[PDB]
Design a protein around this ligand. Structure first.
Ligand SMILES: CCCCC/C=C\C=C\[C@@H](O)CCCCCCCC(=O)O
Ligand SMILES: CCCCC/C=C\C=C\[C@@H](O)CCCCCCCC(=O)O
Length: 257
């Protein structure tokens, strides 16, 4: 029954809005100009960065640390969202942990695209905008940190998905039965099956003229895997070049594959 799938799509979108304070709908309103009361302050260099802190220790390190906090906060939002996916909290606790461990960064980059355009990324709940060029000019090895995320976003954003679409896609990512170390794959696959059915119907109804959007979206999951791997390799470099900088415990536990 497509009625049961629509109900599921609704539930997930409702939960998504309740779990993520900054939606794509709001991110785009800020970025496009449906503003006057939502205009962000733009950081494109040092002085503007200094000016930014006023109404929003080398530069690179500070920016990376703030980035760590936001990532940790995002893990929290995603964990809260995960609990609303029917069947998730009823799985073996060890598996719930494994799914989150491997799913959170793929979700972080998927949603990060909502805050990006080819010129930069929204920061601090949308109050600021840091240009891609500025980030690209940070000393090594931080200058190459975000570039791959922007490249992904530019392409991913071309799919023109909205929050109701993303809510289901994110649920699909979390319930991946192929994650390393899963104890009971079957119950997870059965849940993903239902989620895949919901995503398929949603895309057909929400994007009637977008042929094979469903398949094109699932293929993006390959891009997300890639991004994580490179990111991990870059993190390895930072660990060794900055021995005076500390990586957040939660994040360390996540990468401790
Ligand atoms: C140093 C960067 C500061 C970024 C803060 C900007 C937006 C954060 C908003 C969150 O609270 C709730 C929004 C839902 C999470 C999805 C945002 C995209 C992502 O960060 O993965
Ligand atoms: C050093 C470059 C910092 C650029 C920060 C600009 C936008 C960031 C938005 C955040 O929500 C998402 C950033 C996640 C990147 C990785 C964070 C660390 C990690 O979780 O591994």
């Amino acid at each position: 029954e497509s009625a049961d799938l629509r109900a599921l799509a609704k539930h997930l979108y409702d939960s998504y809005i309740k779990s993520f304070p900054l939606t794509k709908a709001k991110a785009r309103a800020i970025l496009t100009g449906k503003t006057t009361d939502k205009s962000p302050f733009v950081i494109y260099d040092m002085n503007s960065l200094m000016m930014g802190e006023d109404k929003i220790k080398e530069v690179a390190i500070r920016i990376f640390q703030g980035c760590q906090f936001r990532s940790v906060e995002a893990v929290q939002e995603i964990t809260e969202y995960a609990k609303s996916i029917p069947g998730f909290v009823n799985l073996d606790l060890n598996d719930q942990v494994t799914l989150l461990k491997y799913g959170v960064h793929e979700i972080i980059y998927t949603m990060l695209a909502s805050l990006m355009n080819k010129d930069g990324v929204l920061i601090s709940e949308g109050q600021g905008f840091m240009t891609r060029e500025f980030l690209k000019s940070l000393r090594k090895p931080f200058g190459d940190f975000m570039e791959p995320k922007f490249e992904f976003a530019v392409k991913f954003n071309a799919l023109e998905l909205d929050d109701s679409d993303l809510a289901i896609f994110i649920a699909v990512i979390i319930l991946s039965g192929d994650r390393p170390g899963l104890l009971n794959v079957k119950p997870i696959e059965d849940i993903q099956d239902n989620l895949l059915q919901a995503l398929e119907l949603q895309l057909k109804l929400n994007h009637p003229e977008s042929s094979q959007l469903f398949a094109k979206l699932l293929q993006k999951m390959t891009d997300l895997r890639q991004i994580v791997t490179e990111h991990v390799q870059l993190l390895q470099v930072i660990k060794k070049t900055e021995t005076d900088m500390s990586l957040h415990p939660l994040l360390q536990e996540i990468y401790k594959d």
